Design a protein around this ligand. Structure first.
Ligand SMILES: Nc1nc2c(ncn2[C@@H]2O[C@H](COP(=O)(O)OP(=O)(O)NP(=O)(O)O)[C@@H](O)[C@H]2O)c(=O)[nH]1
Ligand SMILES: O[C@H]1CO[C@H]2OCC[C@H]21
Ligand SMILES: O[C@H]1CO[C@H]2OCC[C@H]21
Ligand SMILES: O[C@H]1CO[C@H]2OCC[C@H]21
Ligand SMILES: O[C@H]1CO[C@H]2OCC[C@H]21
Ligand SMILES: O[C@H]1CO[C@H]2OCC[C@H]21
Ligand SMILES: O[C@H]1CO[C@H]2OCC[C@H]21
Ligand SMILES: O[C@H]1CO[C@H]2OCC[C@H]21
Ligand SMILES: O[C@H]1CO[C@H]2OCC[C@H]21
Ligand SMILES: O[C@H]1CO[C@H]2OCC[C@H]21
Ligand SMILES: O[C@H]1CO[C@H]2OCC[C@H]21
Ligand SMILES: O[C@H]1CO[C@H]2OCC[C@H]21
Ligand SMILES: O[C@H]1CO[C@H]2OCC[C@H]21
Ligand SMILES: O[C@H]1CO[C@H]2OCC[C@H]21
Ligand SMILES: [Ca+2]
Ligand SMILES: [Ca+2]
Ligand SMILES: [Ca+2]
Ligand SMILES: [Mg+2]
Length: 156
């Protein structure tokens, strides 16, 4: 019935699971339980089409994915620097450079920012992908991030 397999990747603790839970269940996960591999399904209407989102939430501590959210946290410079390695791993497993992706800078509700918006925009630009900032806590940008990924998949 038209399904999209979205894979969420990124360093430990950047908020992959909190983002996913906010999207699917509309509440914020405050505690930190490291993930191994969890998947969720949700039926939603995106741009006039009823579809099934299968979201694969991965460990920060891929073969089946149609699009990838590459997540870092804006108060976590190491997680941003790690993005290069995550994208390379994705391309290694997919054996292609033509993989739908969105770059996500999470935790934008926090003030200890060490990754400036412009730096992330430039990274995304070099990859030919959108950059979207999010807060799993406030829900800001969460729908933008996941729905923009769906819209990118539809372009490939
Ligand atoms: N302030 C704030 N805290 C957040 C945000 N997203 C996640 N967190 C917090 O960061 C911690 C880790 O979140 P989590 O979703 O488990 O991260 P993860 O990327 O899934 N970790 P792992 O790779 O180990 O599974 C939790 O305490 C969570 O509440 C956010 O947008 N804002
Ligand atoms: O997971 C949270 C708590 O610990 C920090 O480490 C990086 C991610 C942050
Ligand atoms: O809330 C938005 C973002 O997530 C979707 O799930 C159902 C409603 C949609
Ligand atoms: O307490 C941690 C876990 O949840 C976030 O909310 C703001 C502070 C962060
Ligand atoms: O302890 C820190 C790191 O992990 C979060 O969980 C809730 C409190 C936050
Ligand atoms: O139980 C606490 C201490 O260990 C972590 O693992 C998952 C839940 C967290
Ligand atoms: O793994 C997801 C689903 O359960 C939440 O609790 C902690 C991590 C979150
Ligand atoms: O949360 C951590 C600690 O225990 C493992 O079980 C599944 C998730 C892993
Ligand atoms: O199956 C759908 C409906 O409820 C949500 O919780 C996790 C998966 C989502
Ligand atoms: O190795 C890290 C980076 O990608 C995820 O896939 C499974 C384990 C996670
Ligand atoms: O800094 C290392 C240890 O914590 C992880 O979070 C993102 C960066 C990773
Ligand atoms: O394994 C990760 C870290 O190093 C990159 O090399 C290709 C796969 C990527
Ligand atoms: O999760 C609790 C603790 O922090 C607040 O932020 C929004 C939800 C509230
Ligand atoms: O802050 C969130 C909510 O709205 C979007 O605009 C830019 C960042 C995203
Ligand atoms: Ca909560
Ligand atoms: Ca390969
Ligand atoms: Ca929106
Ligand atoms: Mg997780």
């Amino acid at each position: 019935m038209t399904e999209y397999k979205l894979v969420v990747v990124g360093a430990g603790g950047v908020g992959k699971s909190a983002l996913t839970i906010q999207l699917i269940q509309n509440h914020f996960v405050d505690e930190y339980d490291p993930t191994i591999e969890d998947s969720y399904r949700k039926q939603v209407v995106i741009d006039g089409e009823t579809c099934l989102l299968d979201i694969l939430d991965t460990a920060g501590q891929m073969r089946t994915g149609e699009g990838f959210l590459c997540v870092f946290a804006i108060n976590n410079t190491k997680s941003f620097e790690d993005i290069h390695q995550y994208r390379e791993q994705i391309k290694r497993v997919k054996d292609s450079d033509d993989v739908p992706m969105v770059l996500v800078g999470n935790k934008c509700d926090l003030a200890a920012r060490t990754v400036e918006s412009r730096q992330a925009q430039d990274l995304a630009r070099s990859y030919g992908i959108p950059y979207i900032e999010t807060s799993a806590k406030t829900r800001q940008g969460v729908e933008d991030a996941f729905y923009t990924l769906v819209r990118e998949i539809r372009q490939h």
